[PDB]
Amino acid sequence: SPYGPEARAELSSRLTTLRNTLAPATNDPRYLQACGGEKLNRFRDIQCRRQTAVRADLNANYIQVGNTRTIACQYPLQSQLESHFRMLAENRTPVLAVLASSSEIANQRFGMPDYFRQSGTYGSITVESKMTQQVGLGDGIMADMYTLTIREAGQKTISVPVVHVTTWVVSSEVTKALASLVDQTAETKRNMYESKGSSAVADDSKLRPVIHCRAGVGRTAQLIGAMCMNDSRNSQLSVEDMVSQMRVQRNGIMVQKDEQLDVLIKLAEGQGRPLLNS
Numbered sequence: 701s702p703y704g705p706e707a708r709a710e711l712s713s714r715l716t717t718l719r720n721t722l723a724p725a726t727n728d729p730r731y732l733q734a735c736g737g738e739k740l741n742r743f744r745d746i747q748c749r750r751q752t753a754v755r756a757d758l759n760a761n762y763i764q765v766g767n768t769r770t771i772a773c774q775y776p777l778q779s780q781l782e783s784h785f786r787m788l789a790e791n792r793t794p795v796l797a798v799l800a801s802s803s804e805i806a807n808q809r810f811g812m813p814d815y816f817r818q819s820g821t822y823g824s825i826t827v828e829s830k831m832t833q834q835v836g837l838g839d840g841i842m843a844d845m846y847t848l849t850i851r852e853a854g855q856k857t858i859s860v861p862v863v864h865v866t867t868w869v870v871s872s873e874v875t876k877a878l879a880s881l882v883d884q885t886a887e888t889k890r891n892m893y894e895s896k897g898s899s900a901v902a903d904d905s906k907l908r909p910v911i912h913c914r915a916g917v918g919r920t921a922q923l924i925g926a927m928c929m930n931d932s933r934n935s936q937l938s939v940e941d942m943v944s945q946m947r948v949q950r951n952g953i954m955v956q957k958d959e960q961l962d963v964l965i966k967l968a969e970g971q972g973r974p975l976l977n978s
Contacts, residue, residue, distance in 0.1 A: 703969045711940060711975050712961065718944060722952030731951070732756070742774045742811075745953075746915045752949045754791075757783045759916070761950040762905060763924065765942055766934035770924055771908040772950055774916040775800055775812050782823040784815070789850045792893055792900040792907050793860040795886035796848065797878070799913035799920060802866045812914070816848055816862050825852045835863075837877040842866050845885075860910075861885050868919055871959075872966050879926035882909060917953040918960065921946055925955070925964040929971060938974040939964055 701707065724731045724747045731747040734740035741747050741759050754760040758780055760773035771791065775798075776784040788796065798816065805812050819828050828849040835843035846862040863882055886909050893901055900906040909927070913919040925942055928934050942964065946954040955961050968975060 703965065703975065707975050708965065711965075712958070714940060714976070715943060715947075715955070715961075718947055719952035722947055724951070732759070738779060739777065740780075742777065743915055746774070746917055747951055749948070749950050755783055755787055758787060760787060762908070763946060763949050765924065765928045765945045766931065766937045768924075768928035768931045768934060769904060769908050770927065771910045772916050772920050772924060772946075772954075773910070773912045775912055775914050776815070777811060778813050781813055781815055782825060785822060785825045785827060785850050786852075788848070788860050788910060789852070789855065789858040790906070791910070792858060792898065793910050794889040794893075794907050795863060795882050796860050796910040797863040797865070797882045797912075797920075797923060799865045799868065799911070799923060801868055802864075804914065810914070816846055816864065817844075825850065827851075832861075835881055837865075837874050837881070839870050839874055841868075841874055843878070843881060861889050865919075871922075872963050875922055875926045875963055876930075876967065879923060879930050882911075882923070883927060883930055915953070915956075917951060918956045921954040921956070922960045922963055926967060929964075929967055929973065936974065938977050939968050940975065940977050 727733065730750060732750045732753050748759045749761055752761045754762055754771060758773060760771060763770050763772050800812060804810050805814055817829055830847045832845045832847055835845060837843055844864040844866060847859050848862050849859045851857050863885060865878065890907050911920045911923055924946060928942065943955045
């Protein structure tokens with residue numbers, strides 16, 4: 701009964717109304733707007749919460765679910781690339797997990813600049829890519845990993861570790877392994893900034909994991925849900941609290957497909973974690 705069809709129905713009931721009310725209106729004051737005609741939102745009905753926006757020219761949000769602080773965004777457009785690398789540099793990104801498969805990146809009808817597997821110049825910023833290791837996550841789902849070195853004239857040189865998932869019931873055991881790889885990758889880089897006494901360890905808006913696939917509300921909301929369940933500080937945090945904080949801080953489309961919620965439900969059932977708030 702605590703994870704049976706009745707409680708699952710009450711969950712999807714309280715969540716589907718939250719999505720409907722957080723659906724954006726034309727020129728919505730809760731959501732970031734595009735000034736000058738420069739396209740900001742990759743999709744027309746998937747926008748960005750203004751109160752938690754990372755940068756004005758990105759569809760990106762600061763997200764703290766429980767005690768876990770991360771950054772979720774969409775796949776950057778070509779016009780947003782220069783400012784996308786500035787976010788990763790200023791944030792002192794300890795980990796960047798991109799969940800868009802290799803197939804949709806190469807499909808140019810989708811418009812996804814391969815900004816992490818290549819080098820290139822994006823205005824003021826030069827980018828150097830170097831692949832490292834390949835991590836198997838079961839099911840033949842692979843994690844190609846790169847070290848994105850970010851160099852701007854007059855700015856500090858910052859390298860960010862990248863975790864690229866090339867594809868997408870076992871997704872429960874796949875997301876549990878992916879969240880672990882992302883957490884451990886972030887810990888090593890975060891511990892590096894700590895050994896050199898970086899100013900950004902004190903700033904809680906920095907050193908935030910960066911996660912995006914395409915819209916940043918589908919596979920990423922599933923990854924963020926597992927990352928915070930992996931966190932030790934988030935005890936008794938209900939699944940209602942998990943996805944409602946993800947939706948209020950970004951948009952109501954977080955945890956988009958009903959199958960993505962089922963992965964977060966079973967991961968909670970394994971931990972004895974509540975689904976609903978009493």
